[PDB]
Design an enzyme around this catalytic site. Structure first.
Site: not given
Ligand SMILES: C[C@@]12CCCO[C@H]1[C@]1(COC(N)=N1)c1cc(-c3cccnc3F)ccc1O2
Ligand code: NI
Length: 393
Positions: A223, A34
């Site tokens: 991202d 991420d």
């Molecule tokens: C890490 C956080 C918690 C904190 C806020 O950000 C969140 C987020 C959302 O955007 C990003 N970049 N990370 C995130 C993305 C996914 C996901 C879901 C589906 C596909 N791909 C993914 F990365 C899952 C969990 C998640 O939790």
């Protein structure tokens, strides 16, 4: 970096993960990569969607930090206990580091049923770490404790189950087998998210002709943790209007354009040519220069095999509206080899050796484009008293 090629896996729309080990002896876990967050956080208790979790008690090298962490976000939350332990990436660099690990004890709408990951590796900067920026992110620890260069690169390659995906995370360098042509760099505007500046947007060669600050309202980021290309409301509306117009021979339901409904054609008959290419011009390293990254409908129309009509090729529209700026998610990244050059505060793009295309068009990275007296396209987020009151010693 042959050992690191093809080290990423996942299910379409559910994120790319890398195998990691935590603790002594090593406990293997699948960890979401991420670039939009900054904590290393792993499931550390039973959950219906977890086949396994981090067992702190089985690790002789685990140390409790005696401090909790609570991370709410738009969809839900995760929380848990901070600590440190030994961490490695089996299909990564041949090093072991002591990193902060947030042991997730409770969550809501965080884990995804069937995604096959149990944790998240936040690769962004300390500024957006929780509970605060003194909790050193994983990559920072890796760099400081080892001789690994301060750079990583990502090549994301895009009936009953979702489609499998794969890719590569190269830590410490650039693998030339993963791209073709020129590698173009855009500055990291500020080290928090991987923030960048978009100076122009075209849809099938046609300029959207908006004040360029609108493209970066209130930020633009790269991202890996977002599936879609997300666009600020005004930009999203203008883009949808243009894509609608190019594809007008096909009248899709409103549901499709909202990303809430699939559209299908008979197998192998998808009329790719009615859908336009989308070009994002990114600020160059040189002040008045830019380069463009161009993606195909093959990137922004995501394949989903419908059980009810398994003989059809069905697609979701993967461009969506944002209220928190532009997000160049997997939709964008799947066209390109993306170099997160932290050492030089820049992000590199080149055409991916694994991107999906056809015989007529390809994802492209092209430049330079020069503009006389180039405007400042960056947006300055209004400063809250909360943010201003923070001391950064
Ligand atoms: C890490 C956080 C918690 C904190 C806020 O950000 C969140 C987020 C959302 O955007 C990003 N970049 N990370 C995130 C993305 C996914 C996901 C879901 C589906 C596909 N791909 C993914 F990365 C899952 C969990 C998640 O939790
Ligand atoms: Ni102070």
């Amino acid at each position: 970096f042959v050992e690191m090629v093809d080290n990423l896996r996942g299910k379409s729309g559910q994120g790319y993960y890398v195998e990691m080990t935590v603790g002594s002896p090593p406990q293997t876990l699948n960890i979401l990569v991420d670039t939009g967050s900054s904590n290393f956080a792993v499931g550390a208790a039973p959950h219906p969607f977890l086949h396994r979790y981090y067992q702190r008690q089985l690790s002789s090298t685990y140390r409790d930090l005696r401090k909790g962490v609570y991370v709410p976000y738009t969809q839900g939350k995760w929380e848990g206990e901070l600590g440190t332990d030994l961490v490695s990436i089996p299909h990564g660099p041949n090093v072991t580091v002591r990193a902060n690990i947030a042991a997730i004890t409770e969550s809501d709408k965080f884990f995804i049923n069937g995604s096959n990951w149990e944790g998240i590796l936040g690769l962004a900067y300390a500024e957006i770490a929780r509970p605060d920026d003194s909790l050193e992110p994983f990559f920072d620890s890796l760099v400081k404790q080892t001789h690994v260069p301060n750079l990583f690169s990502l090549q994301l390659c895009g009936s009953e189950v979702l489609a499998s995906v794969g890719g590569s995370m190269i830590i410490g360098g650039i693998d030339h087998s993963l791209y073709t042509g020129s590698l173009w760099y855009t500055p990291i505007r500020r080290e928090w998210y991987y923030e960048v500046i978009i100076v122009r947007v075209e849809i099938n060669g046609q300029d959207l002709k908006m004040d360029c600050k609108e493209y970066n309202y209130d930020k633009s980021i790269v991202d890996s943790g977002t599936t879609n290309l997300r666009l600020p409301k005004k930009v999203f509306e203008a883009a949808v209007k243009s894509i609608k117009a190019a594809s007008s021979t096909e009248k899709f339901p409103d549901g499709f354009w909202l990303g809430e409904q699939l559209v299908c054609w008979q197998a192998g008959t998808t009329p790719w040519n009615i859908f336009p290419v989308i070009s994002l011009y990114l600020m160059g390293e040189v002040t008045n220069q830019s380069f463009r990254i161009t993606i195909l409908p093959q990137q922004y129309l995501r394949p989903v095999e419908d059980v009810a009509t398994s003989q059809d090729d069905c697609y979701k529209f993967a461009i969506s509206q944002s209220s928190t700026g532009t997000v160049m998610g997997a939709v964008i990244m799947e066209g390109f080899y993306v170099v997160f050059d932290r050492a030089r505060k820049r992000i590199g793009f080149a055409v991916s050796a694994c991107h999906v295309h056809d015989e007529f068009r390809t994802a492209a990275v092209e430049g330079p484009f020069v503009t006389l007296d180039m405007e400042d396209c960056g947006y300055n987020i209004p400063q809250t008293d909360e943010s201003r009151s923070h001391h950064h010693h």
